């Protein structure tokens, strides 16, 4: 469960990401494809070379979804309802992969947010991605 502090922490941290979100999402994704090769089995139709337009593209898409969750941090289940249905009925991604991507977002944000990636935030960000993950994974069976 996110606490009042946790939320403030996510909004402040996310706010600083600002117009770079898209740029970050892609990197998050590329760090993922590299460190955890298995995750690629979900993207056989994707061109996975460094600097790929589909990766930049999906990158933005992931960052927009996340941005929207921060926008509706008090009602995420209904905010992401759409995305949840997608991943549970069409994509059918195994839950562990969500932890991998989450971990990769953390590295990515920590590589660009020196001053803001404080312990307290790292803890709040880690909980939020866990929430986003649990929602997207909620209707699996």
């Amino acid at each position: 469960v996110l606490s009042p502090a946790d939320k403030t922490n996510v909004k402040a941290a996310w706010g600083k990401v600002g117009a770079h979100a898209g740029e970050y999402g892609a990197e998050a994704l590329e760090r993922m494809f590299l460190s955890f090769p298995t995750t690629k089995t979900y993207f056989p139709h994707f061109d996975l070379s460094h600097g790929s337009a589909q990766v930049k593209g999906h990158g933005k898409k992931v960052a927009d979804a996340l941005t929207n969750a921060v926008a509706h941090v008090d009602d995420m289940p209904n905010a992401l309802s759409a995305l949840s249905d997608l991943h549970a009925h069409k994509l059918r991604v195994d839950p562990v992969n969500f932890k991998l991507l989450s971990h990769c977002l953390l590295v990515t944000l920590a590589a660009h947010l020196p001053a803001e990636f404080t312990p307290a935030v790292h803890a709040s960000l880690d909980k939020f991605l866990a929430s986003v993950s649990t929602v997207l994974t909620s209707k699996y069976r």
């Binding site: 990197e27 760090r31 590295v107 990515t108 920590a110 660009h112 312990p119 307290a120 790292h122 803890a123």
Partner: protein, 146 residues
């Protein structure tokens, strides 16, 4: 431990610029703040209630050093982690009773910290090596569990 020359180079290359004393402190303290449940093993470190209490705790820092200490001994023996860490494994199992699952939490946090300290320099390719490396050590610390 499938580690290629280029990966090993990166791994070792990067580790050369790391202040073990400092990085360790950050790493263990963050593990104690980002995954509170892991405090279950350190009730004797004193104040762990809020972040500053953890990050600042002088025993948390002293211990951090210790851990990261042995972690370097591993990088100097990437070809035989299981042997290097054998006694340490029996320890975390027989005496401390630490669920090996916790070894990966520390690892990933470690990765996060290196990222914080080096920014851009910590390229995707460099992180994949460390992911391999940290996993390696975790599997090795879990090997003597029975």
């Amino acid at each position: 431990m499938h580690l290629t020359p280029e990966e090993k180079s990166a791994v070792t290359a990067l580790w050369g610029k790391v202040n073990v004393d400092e990085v360790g402190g950050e790493a263990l303290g963050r593990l104690l703040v980002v995954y509170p449940e892991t405090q279950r093993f350190f009730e004797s470190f004193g104040d762990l209630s809020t972040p500053d209490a953890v990050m600042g705790n002088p025993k948390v820092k002293a211990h951090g050093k210790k851990v990261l200490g042995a972690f370097s001994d591993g990088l100097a023996h990437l070809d035989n982690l299981k042997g290097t860490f054998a006694t340490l494994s029996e320890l975390h199992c027989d005496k401390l009773h630490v669920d090996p699952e916790n070894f990966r939490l520390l690892g990933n946090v470690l990765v996060c910290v290196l990222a914080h300290h080096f920014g851009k320099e910590f390229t995707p390719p460099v992180q994949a090596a460390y992911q391999k490396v940290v996993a390696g050590v975790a599997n090795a610390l879990a090997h003597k569990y029975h």
